[PDB]
């Protein structure tokens, strides 16, 4: 049901633009929120469709952005 991912281990200088570019490879992004405040190396990536969030988990998770191995996980519950 959730189409949103927590993204962790981002470099301090990583921008929303770079997250847009990387995460758009698995689908269309509805919203990106930098930081842990949905209203530190974390951001939220929300997709329009669940399939696209799953493909980010499958193929973006565990790869590099600003030479850092990023980690993604579902923002659900």
């Amino acid at each position: 049901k959730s189409c949103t991912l927590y993204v962790g281990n981002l470099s301090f200088y990583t921008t929303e633009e770079q997250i847009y570019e990387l995460f758009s490879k698995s689908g269309d992004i509805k919203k990106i929120i930098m930081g842990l405040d949905k209203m530190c190396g974390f951001c939220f990536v929300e997709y329009y469709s669940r399939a696209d969030a799953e493909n980010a988990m499958r193929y973006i998770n565990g790869t590099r952005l600003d030479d850092r191995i990023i980690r993604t996980d579902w923002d659900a519950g």
């Binding site: 921008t15 570019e21 490879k25 269309d28 493909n55 193929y59 790869t63 600003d66 030479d67």
Partner: protein, 728 residues
């Protein structure tokens, strides 16, 4: 319990302390013992691995063979059940699965479960499909493919038993193959060049492989046949005869696979010190690649497992596996119309592979990259975009390290040429995953001019603009007003002091708003959200919508990524519509950027949003079918379906118009038609068809009647004809 057997069947052949032979015989004994209370389940389970695990084909036929040897009746019921499944797979248009079922029945001959004349008869029937009248070539093609592609497995046995009968089937096959239309070929080739490797139509290629196999007396060197170890157990006395099989008639709802072109980039000279690479026309090459593609299909979701399964791919003899893997992966990524799986998967798969075989795979991938670069001149544009997106992303995972000096030949070429353009586009992508100065620094000084420009905002009324510019005073007022966080009415009030759909109002408003939120995507997004009313009012007309896009471009031309997200946001919030964007894409203002990737990225993103909007509303409508509303929603879908159809009509119209204009001018001036600009344009038109074939197919009559008519210049009409040939 039913779940237990499923596990034993599904896992046999995997990593084990015992030999494969041991586990097969052991498993056979276990399945036999459960026939009384699980026969029907075991049948279905075996029928399932037969259609879903073609990469494990000979392991499962062997199992069935051992089972049949223990219980003849069961084997009869299996073969019976396989014929049923085949009919059903064919009914559900799962021609892909059907091929595997045919291959399974074929290899069962080798296991002596099925008598050879039964398959000879079945194949005589498949080939008679090519004699049917007024049926799609793709239909005839499939039956011929299913037959020929089974031969690496069962060719020898069929020829041993019924050589005269087979020769007749081949005679008929060859005559069919000689009269096939090849209209679809140019639209599916990754490269048009014949050298170093022709990109061959799949049936032409396969026929040549079969001829080589025949010349070799039906002997091949790759397929593993576990059954050859059970020669004492398996014997002709255990054969079954198949019930007659008549290929279901072609109906209205029949959907056959599109034709294919064989991706080919390596030959034995690319690994000159390894085991001699199986040639392009060997069945070994066919089988290796088919199995590798099947492995990816089974494990695409799990990149680690996928990489492991590819690296552990077994074979009768030594082959340059790393080359085959890399080649198959690029075959998928560059497949036209589309890869079997989401593009990004391949990027991460290659990274997993590099980690798994650090001492051997990276060299091969680097060699493959060099070769792809060196062959760019005739690579189809759609494939070049994928190459660009892949390579840049790949580089970002390896500190953007590349030996650009290897590619110095692009430096002295026309900047519009495929090589220097590829390089510029790659560097532009790298910047999007990085920073401007960072990318400027990864290249040698000789490449510095190919690096992207700093993505800075261009403000028409900034500290440098002459106050003589129209609306200059208002722009300033707007600027200060925006800082004071004004309301829409407050901005409206200011705008009214602009003379003249008011293009100047739009210009001073967009320039000023965009310039102020120029710090981030988020600021630009919230600025668009905040002054939505203003946009909707200023851009209520079509002219207004176009002028917004136009001014936006004047502001952000140095920042293609910003343009993309802005256009997308403007579409989603209805500041503009897709028709306006399509018109903007083909506008004179974009002419100098027309061949750049970003333009096509936006156009296709725009098309995709339109398509998804249609699907979304259709869904709601359907949902109400199950539950004044359902009907009212039906009006929203017809409007969306119309907007969508119209989007395509406009895009095609614009392409026809600009290509005609180019074609006409080249005749008038006696200049060459084939320019870099033309290569892009025509292949971009081709790409519209390839990326949205499923949707466009419903517009065929309209397109043919209104736009792609018999009088259309042949260069343009050919694209439509190539597209039609995908299902003719």
């Amino acid at each position: 319990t039913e779940d237990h057997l499923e596990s034993l069947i599904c896992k046999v052949g995997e990593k084990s302390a015992c030999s494969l032979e041991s586990n097969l015989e052991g498993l056979a004994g276990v399945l036999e013992a459960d026939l009384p209370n699980y026969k029907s389940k075991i049948l279905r389970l075996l029928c399932t691995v037969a259609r879903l695990l073609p990469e494990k084909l000979t392991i499962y036929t062997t199992l069935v063979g051992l089972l049949n040897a223990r219980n003849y009746n069961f084997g009869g019921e299996f073969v019976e059940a396989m014929i049923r499944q085949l009919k059903e797979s064919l009914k559900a248009n799962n021609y892909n699965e059907a091929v595997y079922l045919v291959r399974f029945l074929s290899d069962l001959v080798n296991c002596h479960v099925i008598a050879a004349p039964s398959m000879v008869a079945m194949f005589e029937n498949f080939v008679s499909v090519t004699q049917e009248e007024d049926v799609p070539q793709v239909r005839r093609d499939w039956y011929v493919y299913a037959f020929l592609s089974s031969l690496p497995w069962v060719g020898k046995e069929l020829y041993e038993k019924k050589d005269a009968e087979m020769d007749r089937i081949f005679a008929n096959t060859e005559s069919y193959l000689k009269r096939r239309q090849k209209t679809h070929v140019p639209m599916l080739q990754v490269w048009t060049a014949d050298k170093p490797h022709p990109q061959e139509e799949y049936l032409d290629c396969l026929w040549a492989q079969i001829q080589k196999l025949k010349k070799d007396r039906w002997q091949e060197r790759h397929i593993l046949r576990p059954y050859l170890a059970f020669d004492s157990i398996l014997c002709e006395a255990l054969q079954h005869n198949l019930p007659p099989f008549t290929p279901p008639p072609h109906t209205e709802d029949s959907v056959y696979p599109m034709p294919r072109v064989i991706f080919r980039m390596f030959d034995y000279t690319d690994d000159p010190e390894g085991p001699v690479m199986p040639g392009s026309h060997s069945v070994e090459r066919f089988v290796i690649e088919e199995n590798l593609h099947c492995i990816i299909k089974s494990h695409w979701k799990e990149r680690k497992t996928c990489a492991a399964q590819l690296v552990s791919y077994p074979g009768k003899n030594k082959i340059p596996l790393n080359y085959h893997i890399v080649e198959v992966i690029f075959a998928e990524l560059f497949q036209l119309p589309a890869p079997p799986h989401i593009d990004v998967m391949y990027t991460t798969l290659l990274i997993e592979l590099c980690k798994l075989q650090p001492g051997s795979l990276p060299q091969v991938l680097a060699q493959a990259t060099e070769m792809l670069y060196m062959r760019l001149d005739t690579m189809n544009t759609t494939c070049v975009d994928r190459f660009i997106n892949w390579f840049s992303h790949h580089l970002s995972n390896f500190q953007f390290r590349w030996s650009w000096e290897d590619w110095s030949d692009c430096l002295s070429q026309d900047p519009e040429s495929p090589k220097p353009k590829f390089v510029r586009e790659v560097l532009e992508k790298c910047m999007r995953l990085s920073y401007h100065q960072r990318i400027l620094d990864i290249v040698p000084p000789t490449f510095s001019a190919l690096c992207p420009s700093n993505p800075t905002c261009i403000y028409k009324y900034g500290d440098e603009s002459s106050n003589s510019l129209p609306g200059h005073s208002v722009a300033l007022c707007l600027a200060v007003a925006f800082k004071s966080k004004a309301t829409n009415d407050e901005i409206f009030s200011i705008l009214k002091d602009v003379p003249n759909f008011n293009p100047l109002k739009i210009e001073v408003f967009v320039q000023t708003l965009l310039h102020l939120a120029a710090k981030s995507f988020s600021h630009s997004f919230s600025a668009l959200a905040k002054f939505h009313e203003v946009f909707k009012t200023l851009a209520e007309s079509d002219e207004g919508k176009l002028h917004v896009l136009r001014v936006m471009f004047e502001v952000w031309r140095n920042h293609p990524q910003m343009i993309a997200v802005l256009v997308d946001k403007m579409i989603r919030t209805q500041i503009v519509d897709c028709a306006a964007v399509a018109n903007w894409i083909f506008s004179s203002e974009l002419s100098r950027d027309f061949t750049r990737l970003f333009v096509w990225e936006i156009l296709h993103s725009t098309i995709r949003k339109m398509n998804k909007h249609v699907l979304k509303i259709q869904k709601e409508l359907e949902e109400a079918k199950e539950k004044e509303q359902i009907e009212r929603l039906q009006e929203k879908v017809e409007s969306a379906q119309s907007e969508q159809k119209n989007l395509f009509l406009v895009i095609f119209q614009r392409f026809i118009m600009i290509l005609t204009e180019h074609l006409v001018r080249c005749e008038t001036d006696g200049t060459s038609v084939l320019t870099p600009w033309y290569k892009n344009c025509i292949e971009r038109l081709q790409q519209i068809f390839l990326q949205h074939h499923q949707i466009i197919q419903q517009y065929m009559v309209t397109l043919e009647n209104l736009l792609f008519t018999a009088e259309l210049d042949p260069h343009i009409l050919a694209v439509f004809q190539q597209f039609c040939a995908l299902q003719a």
